[PDB]
Design a protein around this ligand. Structure first.
Ligand code: NA
Length: 77
């Protein structure tokens, strides 16, 4: 009841599922976080690093080498 149950993974997942193409570059994911949250626009080193590790470590986030540039997707199972 102090904090919502959100994690970086669930927020990254909402950002990817909110787009019609269901894919986002790391930079687009960054801009989504800065649009959504006022604090993320202020200070940047710690949260951007957490976002990168969540994309990398979680198997449900898949990096696709799209010809226009690498994008991140969600692949449950
Ligand atoms: Na991953």
């Amino acid at each position: 009841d102090v904090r919502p149950p959100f994690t970086y993974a669930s927020l990254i997942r909402q950002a990817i599922l909110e787009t019609p193409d269901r894919q986002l570059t790391l930079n687009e994911i960054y801009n989504w976080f800065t649009r959504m949250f006022a604090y993320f626009r202020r200070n940047t080193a710690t949260w951007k690093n957490a976002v990168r590790h969540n994309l990398s470590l979680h198997k449900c986030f898949v990096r696709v080498e799209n010809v226009k540039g690498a994008v991140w997707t969600v692949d449950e199972r």
